Design an enzyme around this catalytic site. Structure first.
Site, short mmCIF file in Angstrom:
data_model
loop_
_atom_site.label_atom_id
_atom_site.label_comp_id
_atom_site.label_asym_id
_atom_site.label_seq_id
_atom_site.Cartn_x
_atom_site.Cartn_y
_atom_site.Cartn_z
N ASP A 1 0.94 -1.16 0.10
CA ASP A 1 0.01 -0.03 -0.12
C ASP A 1 0.91 1.22 0.09
OD1 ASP A 1 -2.11 2.02 0.65
OD2 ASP A 1 -3.24 0.34 1.21
N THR B 1 -6.94 3.58 -2.07
CA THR B 1 -6.80 1.90 -1.79
C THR B 1 -7.94 1.14 -2.47
OG1 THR B 1 -5.43 2.47 0.10
CG2 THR B 1 -6.28 0.50 0.10
N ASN C 1 -12.89 5.72 -1.32
CA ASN C 1 -12.65 5.09 0.06
C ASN C 1 -14.08 5.12 0.95
OD1 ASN C 1 -10.18 3.84 -0.42
ND2 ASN C 1 -9.13 5.62 0.73
N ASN D 1 -24.46 10.29 -22.43
CA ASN D 1 -24.70 9.57 -21.23
C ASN D 1 -23.54 9.30 -20.23
OD1 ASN D 1 -23.88 7.40 -22.91
ND2 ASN D 1 -25.59 6.10 -22.49
N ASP E 1 -22.39 6.49 -28.53
CA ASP E 1 -23.83 6.90 -28.47
C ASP E 1 -24.49 6.29 -29.76
OD1 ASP E 1 -23.26 8.22 -25.98
OD2 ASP E 1 -24.12 10.18 -26.95
O1 LIG Z 1 -8.63 0.60 5.52
C1 LIG Z 1 -7.37 0.52 4.89
C2 LIG Z 1 -6.84 -0.86 4.61
C3 LIG Z 1 -8.03 -2.06 4.63
N1 LIG Z 1 -7.61 -3.29 3.88
C4 LIG Z 1 -7.30 -3.32 2.35
C5 LIG Z 1 -7.77 -4.72 1.77
N2 LIG Z 1 -6.88 -5.71 2.53
C6 LIG Z 1 -6.19 -6.66 2.08
O2 LIG Z 1 -5.64 -7.42 2.63
O3 LIG Z 1 -6.30 -6.44 0.54
C7 LIG Z 1 -5.23 -7.41 -0.17
C8 LIG Z 1 -5.73 -7.20 -1.56
C9 LIG Z 1 -7.13 -6.94 -2.07
C10 LIG Z 1 -7.52 -6.63 -3.39
CL1 LIG Z 1 -9.17 -6.45 -3.68
C11 LIG Z 1 -6.43 -6.94 -4.63
C12 LIG Z 1 -5.31 -7.14 -3.81
CL2 LIG Z 1 -3.92 -7.18 -5.20
C13 LIG Z 1 -4.83 -7.19 -2.57
C14 LIG Z 1 -7.09 -5.56 4.01
C15 LIG Z 1 -6.85 -4.13 4.61
C16 LIG Z 1 -6.87 1.68 4.27
C17 LIG Z 1 -5.48 1.70 3.68
C18 LIG Z 1 -4.89 2.73 3.19
C19 LIG Z 1 -5.42 3.99 3.53
N3 LIG Z 1 -4.91 5.28 3.08
C20 LIG Z 1 -5.76 5.99 3.75
O4 LIG Z 1 -5.95 7.19 3.63
O5 LIG Z 1 -6.97 5.32 4.12
C21 LIG Z 1 -6.63 4.02 4.02
C22 LIG Z 1 -7.42 2.80 4.67
CA LIG Z 2 -22.27 6.64 -24.61
CL LIG Z 3 -12.91 8.67 -1.86
ZN LIG Z 4 -3.74 2.51 -0.69
ZN LIG Z 5 -3.44 6.10 2.28
#
Ligand SMILES: O=C(CCN1CCN(C(=O)OCc2cc(Cl)cc(Cl)c2)CC1)c1ccc2[nH]c(=O)oc2c1
Ligand SMILES: [Ca+2]
Ligand SMILES: [Cl-]
Ligand SMILES: [Zn+2]
Ligand SMILES: [Zn+2]
Ligand SMILES: *[C@@H]1O[C@H](CO)[C@@H](O[C@@H]2O[C@H](CO)[C@@H](O[C@@H]3O[C@H](CO[C@H]4O[C@H](CO)[C@@H](O)[C@H](O[C@H]5O[C@H](CO)[C@@H](O)[C@H](O)[C@@H]5O[C@H]5O[C@H](CO)[C@@H](O)[C@H](O)[C@@H]5O)[C@@H]4O)[C@@H](O)[C@H](O)[C@@H]3O)[C@H](O)[C@H]2NC(C)=O)[C@H](O)[C@H]1NC(C)=O
Ligand SMILES: *[C@@H]1O[C@H](CO[C@@H]2O[C@@H](C)[C@@H](O)[C@@H](O)[C@@H]2O)[C@@H](O[C@@H]2O[C@H](CO)[C@@H](O[C@@H]3O[C@H](CO)[C@@H](O)[C@H](O[C@H]4O[C@H](CO)[C@@H](O)[C@H](O)[C@@H]4O)[C@@H]3O)[C@H](O)[C@H]2NC(C)=O)[C@H](O[C@@H]2O[C@@H](C)[C@@H](O)[C@@H](O)[C@@H]2O)[C@H]1NC(C)=O
Ligand SMILES: *[C@@H]1O[C@H](CO)[C@@H](O[C@@H]2O[C@H](CO)[C@@H](O)[C@H](O)[C@H]2NC(C)=O)[C@H](O)[C@H]1NC(C)=O
Ligand SMILES: [Ca+2]
Ligand SMILES: [K+]
Ligand code: NA
Ligand code: NA
Length: 785
Positions: free
Chosen positions: A121, A159, A180, A667, A673
């Protein structure tokens, strides 16, 4: 209700998903408050730490230990990752020479290389510049495997939109995770980073990789790790799963790290406090590689080291307040920060005036650190509009800044992300290492929407329909390349000859006074029309067009301008010249009367009379079949591009081939379109008004060769300009066009692929290049960073 009095004994991180009332032992149990009472004590063991020591070598197995150093640990797949290094004199993976993997080297029972997705991340692309001194394991993967200098994330550069894009190959507007945090007006519910609402399946659209895998009989590991599960445990779990019998072992795995994003927000991307978190992530990569090596999997598995987005230097002091622009901010709800999304505080308030709000947010301060847009006016490259969760009113925030409703809403942060996905600081990383990826290969930057197809190919899966261009990333791979097929032309063109006399026309127009066309002006073959329609190919000395009988204008106009081409002015007496085209019926032609009557609409030409090869050839540029409806405000942009910029590009790029045309996307779904979707016409006529105008500008990558005599790869830059009745988007538009038109065009830069979706046209069908190389060319985006 769930009975937590059950036990996790011999069930830790089981792949079978359990539901209420049975207590769970899988990784996801923590986020559903359904783990068996003994999950922490049995599954989250920490005893004696994560490293083998000399005194532990050949120990009698103790089930209480976090990991093992016993002679049986390799056969059980639960050794501490450094077991062979400490106990058997093996070298750390990072210390080994970079050796080409010509074919997978797997243990018996493996039929294909497994895939491990190592997601990081907030890992900014420029963090790789720290090199081997900070991240030796990651640097080795990068230099030994296949890498891009950076990978482009999706907008918003957050994220949940980016991780779900990685998993689906879809734009957020299509997968539904548009931020988010988001409000769905139909559900009358808000999705948040914290809370239970996000766990509801109703938010998550498309088909993620783990579903694509299971539906095609391929087992997947978890793609969600609970924050309470330490990274060392995530790595050991993956290694344990890789050690399961053939009928139970997953083919795809995912690791996730909250770092370097967490420290990035606290200290900023340039903070000296960033070194230790990057060293810690590198240590985790080292544990995985050592762990794989001792299980004889380091030359078997494909590893993808990938980020979701970058990190920018952002502070509390750098906040723009809507209260400094608007009288009543209490009547509006704002999704704030690195982007702005505005809607009325009361979901369907009749007094909500977005027009008055935008006017008060437009060019009001000289160094204004945001720009308002109705979502349909956002640059098309962002593909951020076709979803009920995306508010009509958007604010694109300048990098390093925040937007907030009012001042009430030391600082908690020094870094943030979410800005426009072309911004350098938002760029993230991509590394592919293993038998299927190329050896010591650098590939050009590409978009994260493309990875889902590649991950499917690496797993032998048929990808679900997505926004990637299948085959555009073939140059990253040794094997498992997708063989793409040229889309079949749906509508064949008519080739009209002279069928009318000058006297057959009554268009209200006035004018004072095949051959080698295809070879010179259509350098990459005719574009194909991928939908059912009626259109004509029209040849001229200086240009060729595909004229639509339905939309009464060209779908495309193609012309080549050499480096030596002369620019001429339109003679005074020919300023208002419009001529009937004797190949096209009056019934299938536009008319000048409609343009004269419409006091807000003027017209432009797709092939510009300014670039005519001779005064005689100039008459062809004034044909009614080359005219398009244009607002006078838009003409300032269009004329500057045609009279100044085309010649500039030809002179700098050694000739250019230009394909220009209209786009109709009322749209805002990013797709061409159909007739029924067109909402504006030239006054009292059936002449449709385009929402946008495009141009595809191609030349030779080797600029020492002219565009019309190019032996090798091509170079392209394209744009999709909004066809607007004003230049409110450009705060400096009162000045000469040399001061603002280029800046506007650069903002609206586009991929050839964006234009193909918006027109139903297929370009570059006849080249001396491989189809895979052409697909890469179509996905290219010229950024002006
Ligand atoms: O809330 C979170 C993180 C929450 N999860 C994200 C998904 N996750 C995970 O293991 O994803 C693993 C995963 C899922 C997927 Cl669809 C695809 C892949 Cl390639 C890998 C668990 C933790 C967060 C993170 C960074 C932030 N920066 C910020 O301002 O707020 C934030 C909140
Ligand atoms: Ca269109
Ligand atoms: Cl957002
Ligand atoms: Zn992120
Ligand atoms: Zn972040
Ligand atoms: C990016 O790539 C995607 C995927 O190919 C393209 O989107 C697809 O476009 C086609 C053509 O317009 C759509 O088909 C039409 O719609 C229905 C079928 O739709 C239903 O079934 C499909 C398949 O099971 C399903 O994916 C659809 O899901 C939508 O609705 C869900 C519930 O509300 C939601 O959770 C999900 O996110 C998705 O919403 C998005 O799409 C809808 C339009 O379908 C849109 O209004 C919304 O704002 C979201 O963007 C749905 O249940 C057929 O009956 C019609 O005949 C017609 O074929 C696909 O549905 C659509 N697929 C997806 C996943 O969005 C994009 O066009 C492409 N973009 C570009 C620019 O190229
Ligand atoms: C919630 O779970 C508790 C823990 O049980 C364990 O976990 C659950 C999820 C499941 O895997 C169980 O199998 C686990 O034991 C429950 O408490 C247990 O209840 C069961 C009865 O339901 C008890 O059992 C007996 O244990 C004896 C040994 O101590 C055995 O001799 C006995 O066997 C006889 O009876 C069976 C059934 O007819 C015959 O087939 C045999 O041949 C033999 O004659 C039983 O197996 C167990 O000991 C309890 N465990 C503990 C630690 O107390 C709990 O059940 C509730 O609370 C208990 C105390 C009783 O009052 C139950 O009646 C009551 O339902 C679960 N809670 C709920 C609400 O279901
Ligand atoms: C847009 O901004 C103008 C100010 O530039 C706002 O108008 C002022 O409103 C106050 C009341 O708070 C009056 O006392 C002033 O006389 C107004 N000034 C002018 C020039 O009219 C206006 O309300 C803002 N509109 C929105 C929708 O926020
Ligand atoms: Ca600091
Ligand atoms: K007019
Ligand atoms: Na969990
Ligand atoms: Na302006």
């Amino acid at each position: 209700w769930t009975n937590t009095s059950g036990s996790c004994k011999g069930r830790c991180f089981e792949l079978q998903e359990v539901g209420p009332p049975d207590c769970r032992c899988d990784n996801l149990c923590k986020s559903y408050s359904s783990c068996c009472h003994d999950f922490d004590e049995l599954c989250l063991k920490t005893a004696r730490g994560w490293e083998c020591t000399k005194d532990r070598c050949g120990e009698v197995r103790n089930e209480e230990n976090a990991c093992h150093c016993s002679e049986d640990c390799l056969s059980r797949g639960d050794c501490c990752t450094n077991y062979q290094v400490v106990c058997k004199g093996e070298s750390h993976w990072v210390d080994d020479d970079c050796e080409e993997i010509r074919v997978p080297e797997c243990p018996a029972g493996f039929v294909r290389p497994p895939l491990i997705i190592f997601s990081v991340d907030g890992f900014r692309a420029s963090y790789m510049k720290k090199g081997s001194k900070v991240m030796p394991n990651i640097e080795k993967l990068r230099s030994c495997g296949t890498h891009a200098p950076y990978m482009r994330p999706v907008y918003p550069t957050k994220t949940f939109p980016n991780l779900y894009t990685l998993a689906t190959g879809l734009y957020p507007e299509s997968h539904g995770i548009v931020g988010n945090s988001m409000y769905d007006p139909v559900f009358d519910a808000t999705f948040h980073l914290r809370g239970r609402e996000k766990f509801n399946h109703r938010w998550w659209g498309g088909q993620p990789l783990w579903i694509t895998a299971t539906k095609q009989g391929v087992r997947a590991g978890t793609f969600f790790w609970s924050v309470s599960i330490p990274h060392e445990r995530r790595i050991l779990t993956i290694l344990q799963w890789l050690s399961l019998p053939d009928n139970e072992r997953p083919s795809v795995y995912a690791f996730y790290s909250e770092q370097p994003d967490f420290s990035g927000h606290k200290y900023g991307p340039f903070g000296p406090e960033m070194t230790n978190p990057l060293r810690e992530i590198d240590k985790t990569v080292g544990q995985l590689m050592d762990g794989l090596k001792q299980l004889k999997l380091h030359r078997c598995v494909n590893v993808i080291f990938v980020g979701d987005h970058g990190m920018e230097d952002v502070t509390c002091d750098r906040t723009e307040f809507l209260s400094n622009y608007l009288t009543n901010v209490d009547d509006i709800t704002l999704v704030p920060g690195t982007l702005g999304r505005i809607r009325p505080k009361i979901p369907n308030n009749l007094k909500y005036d977005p027009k008055a709000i935008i006017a008060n947010l437009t060019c009001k301060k000289p160094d204004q650190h945001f720009k308002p847009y109705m979502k349909q006016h956002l640059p098309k490259r962002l593909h951020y509009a076709n979803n009920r969760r995306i508010e009509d009113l958007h604010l694109l925030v300048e990098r390093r800044w925040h937007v907030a409703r009012k001042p009430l809403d030391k600082c908690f942060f020094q870094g943030d992300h979410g800005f426009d996905n072309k911004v350098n600081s938002m760029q993230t990383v991509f590394v592919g290492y293993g038998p299927t990826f190329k050896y010591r290969t650098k590939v050009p930057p590409f978009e994260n929407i493309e990875l889902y197809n590649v991950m499917c190919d690496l797993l032998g899966l048929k990808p679900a329909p997505n926004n990637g261009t299948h085959g555009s990333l073939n140059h990253l791979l040794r094997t498992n390349t997708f063989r793409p097929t040229l889309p079949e032309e749906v509508s064949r063109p008519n080739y009209p000859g002279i069928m009318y006399l000058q006297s057959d026309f009554d268009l209200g127009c006035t004018c004072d006074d095949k051959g080698s066309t295809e070879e010179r002006h259509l350098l990459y073959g005719r574009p194909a029309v991928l939908y059912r329609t009626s259109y004509d190919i029209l040849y001229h000395t200086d240009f060729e067009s595909g004229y639509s009988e339905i939309f009464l204008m060209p779908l495309w106009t193609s012309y080549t301008i050499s480096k030596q081409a002369e620019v001429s002015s339109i003679p005074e007496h020919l300023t208002n010249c419009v001529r009937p085209d004797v190949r096209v019926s009056p019934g299938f032609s536009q008319n000048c009367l409609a343009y004269k009557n419409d006091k807000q609409m003027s017209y432009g030409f797709l092939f510009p009379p300014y670039l005519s090869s001779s005064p005689e050839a100039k008459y062809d540029a004034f044909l009614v079949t080359n005219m398009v409806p244009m607002y006078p405000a838009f003409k300032r942009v269009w004329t500057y591009f045609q009279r100044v910029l085309v010649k500039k590009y030809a002179s700098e790029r050694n000739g250019v081939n230009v394909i220009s045309g209209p786009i109709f996307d009322y749209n805002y779904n990013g797709l061409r379109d159909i007739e029924d979707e067109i909402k504006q016409y030239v006054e009292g006529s059936s002449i449709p008004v385009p929402t946008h105008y495009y141009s595809i500008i191609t030349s030779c990558l080797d600029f020492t060769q002219p565009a019309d005599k190019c032996d090798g790869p091509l170079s392209v830059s394209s744009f999709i300009l909004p066809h607007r009745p004003d230049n409110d988007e450009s705060c400096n538009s009162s000045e000469d066009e040399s001061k603002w038109v280029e800046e506007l065009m650069k903002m609206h830069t586009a991929r050839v692929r964006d234009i193909e979706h918006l027109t139903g046209l297929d370009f570059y069908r006849k080249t001396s290049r491989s189809y895979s190389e052409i697909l890469t060319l179509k996905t290219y985006l010229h950024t002006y960073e």
